[PDB]
Design an enzyme around this catalytic site. Structure first.
Site, PDB file in Angstrom:
ATOM      1  N   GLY A 185     -23.601  -7.790  43.195  1.00  7.89           N
ATOM      2  CA  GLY A 185     -23.170  -6.481  42.678  1.00  7.89           C
ATOM      3  C   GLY A 185     -21.911  -6.418  41.817  1.00  7.89           C
ATOM      4  CB  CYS A 207     -19.948  -9.144  31.008  1.00  8.89           C
ATOM      5  SG  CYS A 207     -20.430 -10.253  32.377  1.00  8.89           S
ATOM      6  CG  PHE A 252     -19.175  -6.652  49.951  1.00 13.43           C
ATOM      7  CD1 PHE A 252     -18.491  -7.176  51.048  1.00 13.43           C
ATOM      8  CD2 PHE A 252     -18.444  -6.008  48.956  1.00 13.43           C
ATOM      9  CE1 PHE A 252     -17.107  -7.035  51.164  1.00 13.43           C
ATOM     10  CE2 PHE A 252     -17.061  -5.867  49.059  1.00 13.43           C
ATOM     11  CZ  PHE A 252     -16.390  -6.382  50.167  1.00 13.43           C
ATOM     12  CB  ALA A 253     -19.675  -3.234  53.653  1.00 12.42           C
ATOM     13  CG  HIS A 282      -8.761 -24.802  35.671  1.00 14.69           C
ATOM     14  ND1 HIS A 282      -9.945 -24.110  35.807  1.00 14.69           N
ATOM     15  CD2 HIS A 282      -8.358 -24.606  34.392  1.00 14.69           C
ATOM     16  CE1 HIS A 282     -10.242 -23.517  34.665  1.00 14.69           C
ATOM     17  NE2 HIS A 282      -9.295 -23.803  33.789  1.00 14.69           N
ATOM     18  NE  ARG A 314     -11.886 -14.912  44.459  1.00 15.95           N
ATOM     19  CZ  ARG A 314     -12.755 -13.921  44.330  1.00 15.95           C
ATOM     20  NH1 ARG A 314     -13.477 -13.854  43.250  1.00 15.95           N
ATOM     21  NH2 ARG A 314     -12.881 -12.992  45.242  1.00 15.95           N
ATOM     22  CD  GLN A 337     -18.441 -22.232  41.612  1.00 20.42           C
ATOM     23  OE1 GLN A 337     -18.668 -21.281  42.299  1.00 20.42           O
ATOM     24  NE2 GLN A 337     -17.222 -22.679  41.415  1.00 20.42           N
TER      25      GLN A 337
HETATM   26  N1  LIG Z   1     -17.503 -12.374  34.297  1.00 18.46           N
HETATM   27  C1  LIG Z   1     -17.204 -13.367  33.341  1.00 18.46           C
HETATM   28  O1  LIG Z   1     -16.845 -13.033  32.102  1.00 18.46           O
HETATM   29  C2  LIG Z   1     -17.288 -14.824  33.720  1.00 18.46           C
HETATM   30  C3  LIG Z   1     -17.317 -15.801  32.721  1.00 18.46           C
HETATM   31  C4  LIG Z   1     -17.627 -17.121  33.046  1.00 18.46           C
HETATM   32  C5  LIG Z   1     -17.905 -17.451  34.372  1.00 18.46           C
HETATM   33  N2  LIG Z   1     -17.872 -16.495  35.358  1.00 18.46           N
HETATM   34  C6  LIG Z   1     -18.179 -16.908  36.749  1.00 18.46           C
HETATM   35  O2  LIG Z   1     -19.391 -16.333  37.216  1.00 18.46           O
HETATM   36  C7  LIG Z   1     -19.305 -16.013  38.599  1.00 18.46           C
HETATM   37  C8  LIG Z   1     -19.657 -14.543  38.848  1.00 18.46           C
HETATM   38  O3  LIG Z   1     -18.846 -13.711  38.043  1.00 18.46           O
HETATM   39  P1  LIG Z   1     -18.619 -12.140  38.337  1.00 18.46           P
HETATM   40  O4  LIG Z   1     -17.583 -11.679  37.385  1.00 18.46           O
HETATM   41  O5  LIG Z   1     -19.941 -11.472  38.356  1.00 18.46           O
HETATM   42  O6  LIG Z   1     -17.992 -12.106  39.826  1.00 18.46           O
HETATM   43  P2  LIG Z   1     -17.394 -10.761  40.503  1.00 18.46           P
HETATM   44  O7  LIG Z   1     -15.998 -11.017  40.921  1.00 18.46           O
HETATM   45  O8  LIG Z   1     -17.464  -9.602  39.583  1.00 18.46           O
HETATM   46  O9  LIG Z   1     -18.325 -10.519  41.802  1.00 18.46           O
HETATM   47  C9  LIG Z   1     -17.992  -9.567  42.796  1.00 18.46           C
HETATM   48  C10 LIG Z   1     -19.173  -9.367  43.744  1.00 18.46           C
HETATM   49  O10 LIG Z   1     -19.235 -10.419  44.693  1.00 18.46           O
HETATM   50  C11 LIG Z   1     -19.509  -9.938  45.999  1.00 18.46           C
HETATM   51  N3  LIG Z   1     -18.368 -10.177  46.907  1.00 18.46           N
HETATM   52  C12 LIG Z   1     -17.044 -10.245  46.545  1.00 18.46           C
HETATM   53  N4  LIG Z   1     -16.298 -10.459  47.652  1.00 18.46           N
HETATM   54  C13 LIG Z   1     -17.123 -10.529  48.720  1.00 18.46           C
HETATM   55  C14 LIG Z   1     -16.877 -10.734  50.074  1.00 18.46           C
HETATM   56  N5  LIG Z   1     -15.629 -10.646  50.532  1.00 18.46           N
HETATM   57  N6  LIG Z   1     -17.940 -10.759  50.964  1.00 18.46           N
HETATM   58  C15 LIG Z   1     -19.233 -10.581  50.503  1.00 18.46           C
HETATM   59  N7  LIG Z   1     -19.465 -10.376  49.153  1.00 18.46           N
HETATM   60  C16 LIG Z   1     -18.429 -10.351  48.271  1.00 18.46           C
HETATM   61  C17 LIG Z   1     -19.714  -8.437  45.883  1.00 18.46           C
HETATM   62  O11 LIG Z   1     -21.094  -8.143  45.890  1.00 18.46           O
HETATM   63  C18 LIG Z   1     -19.077  -8.079  44.553  1.00 18.46           C
HETATM   64  O12 LIG Z   1     -19.738  -7.003  43.930  1.00 18.46           O
HETATM   65  C19 LIG Z   1     -17.886 -16.337  39.050  1.00 18.46           C
HETATM   66  O13 LIG Z   1     -17.898 -17.533  39.796  1.00 18.46           O
HETATM   67  C20 LIG Z   1     -17.106 -16.508  37.757  1.00 18.46           C
HETATM   68  O14 LIG Z   1     -16.100 -17.487  37.882  1.00 18.46           O
HETATM   69  C21 LIG Z   1     -17.570 -15.190  35.041  1.00 18.46           C
END
Ligand SMILES: NC(=O)c1ccc[n+]([C@@H]2O[C@H](COP(=O)([O-])OP(=O)(O)OC[C@H]3O[C@@H](n4cnc5c(N)ncnc54)[C@H](O)[C@@H]3O)[C@@H](O)[C@H]2O)c1
Length: 403
Positions: free
Chosen positions: A9, A147, A34-35, A211, A323, A117
């Site tokens: 989500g 995004c 997630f809840a 990193h 992270r 990963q």
């Molecule tokens: N968004 C980008 O532009 C981008 C670019 C390159 C790579 N990535 C990688 O892609 C992956 C996903 O990206 P994203 O931006 O969609 O992640 P995000 O941080 O937006 O995802 C959040 C979601 O993860 C779940 N979540 C978070 N904490 C939780 C917890 N405590 N317990 C249970 N569920 C939990 C929830 O459903 C929440 O909606 C990441 O690993 C990121 O490093 C992202």
């Protein structure tokens, strides 16, 4: 009708759900654990359509509008009868989704990690059991877009899209929908997808050491005195840090060559030097390319990026705990170490970064060259699941004695 279930989500899950549901002949279901996140989404959207805004190369913008079939927390509704299942979340949340789907997933299903990963395949085999030999497993290198969410459950914006992208595949005994053409249909014209040679090729080409090495280069022997402002991040490295990166890349090659000699028929020849990788992909942005130090420091795409910091007495100080280390170590560097042990290859440069990084976050994984740390059960190394040999790592089968 092709039936698709999306898990998650966040930023990635919003974008994928909107694009896929706009295609003719597709039905989409959304699952989140997630809840009570699913009930919050349904109430905010109401009777309206979900909107995706796409920035183009011209400078113009395009809008896409659609509506998914259902958004829920119940796995019996979401998983039953699905042809494709796609996971798009941070890595620590993968365990929960595998446990929930187990009693409902069909023999002919295709399971996808976007992005996977490190250690994705070992985890799936442990939880699903015998079922894991019937389905197929597909793993992508990174996320297709950059995004960000603008309004929860209603609007999301795409800042850019990659031109090409690659994925690996392990085939089972059951016939599925064609993996490469089905995934291309859901995404559109870009990016153009291709298949990699081997799943262990995809695993180590992650370059998990990048990193942690940059953080060690700047704060490794810090005395405790503050600085005026936040220093540059990729463009701030020294010559010593550049030599560290070369040594860790050479160790990746040593591991690949040892596997091919011991287990004939496994092609890992597309594993390459990091210097070769930079010149093939960043050629249009680099000013001076005669060595690795100059290739990174003069890269135009790294313009203006700095370290994370916080406010202290007489200046600023480095801010740990985000992270960069909490994901890249247990879900990255530690998995690579397990593979090296099974092959019998020493890796002194990789070991040094592991011991320093685990102390900074207050965790313990490696002790005296062995995987016996206090928090070892929270990682994805093959030995955690009882896969102790190279044959067991490749096939997923364990040996039994006979009287
Ligand atoms: N968004 C980008 O532009 C981008 C670019 C390159 C790579 N990535 C990688 O892609 C992956 C996903 O990206 P994203 O931006 O969609 O992640 P995000 O941080 O937006 O995802 C959040 C979601 O993860 C779940 N979540 C978070 N904490 C939780 C917890 N405590 N317990 C249970 N569920 C939990 C929830 O459903 C929440 O909606 C990441 O690993 C990121 O490093 C992202």
């Amino acid at each position: 009708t092709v039936k698709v279930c999306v898990c998650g989500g966040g930023n990635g899950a919003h974008t994928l759900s909107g694009l896929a549901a706009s295609r003719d002949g597709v039905e989409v279901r959304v699952l989140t654990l997630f809840a009570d996140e699913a009930e919050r989404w349904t109430k905010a959207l109401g009777a309206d359509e979900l909107t995706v805004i796409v920035n183009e190369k011209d400078g113009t913008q395009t809008e896409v509008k659609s509506r998914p079939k259902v958004i829920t927390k119940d796995p019996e509704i979401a998983i039953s009868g699905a042809d494709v299942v796609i996971l798009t979340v941070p890595a620590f949340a993968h365990e929960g989704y595998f446990q929930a789907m187990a009693p409902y997933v069909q023999d002919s299903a295709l399971i996808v990690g976007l992005p996977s990963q490190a250690g994705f395949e070992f985890q799936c085999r442990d939880i699903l059991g015998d079922k894991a030999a019937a389905v197929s497993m597909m793993s992508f290198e990174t996320l297709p877009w950059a995004c960000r969410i603008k309004e929860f459950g209603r609007k999301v914006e795409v800042l850019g899209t990659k031109s090409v992208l690659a994925a690996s595949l392990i085939k089972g005994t059951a016939k599925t929908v064609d993996p490469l053409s089905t995934l291309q249909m859901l995404h559109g014209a870009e990016p153009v997808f291709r298949l990699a040679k081997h799943f262990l090729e995809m695993l180590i080409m992650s370059y998990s050491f990048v990193h942690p090495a940059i953080l060690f280069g700047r704060w490794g022997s810090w005395d405790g005195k503050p600085v005026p402002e936040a220093p540059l991040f990729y463009q701030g490295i020294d010559q010593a840090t550049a030599d560290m990166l070369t040594a860790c890349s050479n160790e990746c090659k040593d591991v690949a060559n040892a596997i091919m000699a011991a287990c004939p028929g496994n092609d890992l020849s597309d594993v390459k030097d990091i210097y070769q990788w930079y010149l093939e992909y960043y050629h249009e942005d680099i000013q001076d390319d005669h060595d690795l130090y100059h290739a990174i420091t003069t890269n135009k795409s790294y313009k203006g990026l700095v370290h994370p910091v916080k406010a202290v007495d007489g200046g600023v100080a480095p801010d740990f705990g985000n992270r960069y280390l909490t994901e890249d170590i247990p879900m990255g560097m530690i998995v690579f170490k397990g593979v090296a042990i099974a092959a019998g290859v020493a890796i002194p440069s990789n070991d040094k970064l592991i011991m320093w990084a685990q102390e900074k976050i207050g965790k313990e994984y490696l002790v005296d060259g062995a995987l016996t740390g206090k928090d070892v059960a929270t990682t994805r190394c093959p030995q955690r699941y009882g896969f102790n040999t190279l044959d067991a790592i490749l096939t997923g089968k364990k040996h039994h004695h006979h009287h």
